């Protein structure tokens, strides 16, 4: 419905900055996203058994979740630097290829991100801009169209 262009990349960057936060807020944010993902595709949980996915309060899972948002952070932050973004998205792709992650999952994840962010920011967020840019980030991780 909208493309991840200059302006929408600029917007998402700002809004991420504001939603992402730090310390305890970041842990909570990290958790809220995964829980929303799991609520939508409880199937996906089995992929996270090695990282105590059964319990989203387990420290090993917090680390994993913060680690994920860490990757998302690099991607969003370089939306305006295509070459760097490409290099980061390839690194991530290499780390997700081999795993059996159907589009179904990335799709739920995206919905979680958008859901939790909209909560963080109240009115001040653009759903269509986010949707486009997360889609764009996810394409590079899947390697699929």
């Amino acid at each position: 419905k909208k493309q991840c262009g200059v302006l929408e990349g600029l917007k998402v960057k700002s809004e991420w900055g504001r939603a992402y936060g730090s310390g305890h807020d970041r842990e909570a944010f990290s958790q809220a996203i995964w829980r929303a993902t799991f609520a939508q595709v409880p199937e996906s949980r089995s992929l996270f058994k090695r990282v105590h996915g059964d319990d989203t309060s387990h420290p090993a899972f917090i680390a994993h979740a913060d680690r994920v948002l860490g990757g998302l952070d690099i991607a969003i932050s370089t939306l305006d630097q295509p070459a760097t973004l490409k290099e980061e998205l390839d690194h991530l792709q290499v780390q997700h290829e081999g795993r059996k992650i159907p589009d179904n999952y990335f799709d739920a994840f995206k919905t979680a991100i958008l859901h939790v962010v909209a909560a963080q920011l109240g009115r001040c967020y653009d759903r269509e801009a986010w949707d486009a840019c997360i889609d764009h980030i996810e394409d590079g991780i899947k390697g699929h169209h």
Binding site: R26, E27, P59, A63, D66, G71, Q81, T84, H91
Partner: protein, 149 residues
């Protein structure tokens, strides 16, 4: 050792670190600073250049190394942002420890030098810097990441 990177210690570290992202072009700052640190690391210990062949340190300004500079800066940002949650921090640093364990050549000596470079560099960017609090906190983190080495 409850006085090494204590409650107030890590709270000072988090507050002072946070100032670096007061603005939106954080990636620009992350890349600049990260690139500077590792560039300096390689300068001091030439064998390090080989260790970063895969991330194309050869072209420090290139998109390859830029992404990597971000990956490390966020790695350090992850640890700092988890200082107020020791068990989660340990899980996080243990994970990093494995990631370096699986790299041939990387050794404790490298992490000691990095600590120094980092201690010199941080006050060059932060005008509010508790050398004592950063030192103890950075040691804890650097040590946990390099124990499997």
């Amino acid at each position: 050792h409850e006085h090494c990177c204590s409650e107030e210690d890590h709270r000072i570290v988090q507050k002072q670190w946070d100032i670096l992202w007061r603005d939106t072009e954080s990636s620009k700052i992350k890349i600049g600073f990260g690139r500077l640190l590792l560039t300096k690391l390689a300068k001091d210990i030439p064998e390090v250049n080989d260790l970063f062949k895969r991330v194309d340190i050869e072209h420090a300004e290139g998109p390859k190394f830029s992404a990597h500079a971000l990956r490390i800066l966020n790695g350090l940002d992850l640890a700092i942002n988890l200082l107020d949650d020791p068990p989660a921090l340990d899980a996080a640093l243990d994970h990093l420890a494995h990631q370096h364990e699986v790299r041939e050549g990387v050794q404790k000596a490298h992490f000691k030098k990095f600590g120094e470079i980092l201690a010199t560099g941080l006050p060059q960017v932060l005008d509010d810097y508790d050398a004592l609090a950063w030192k103890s906190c950075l040691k804890g983190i650097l040590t946990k990441i390099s124990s499997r080495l």
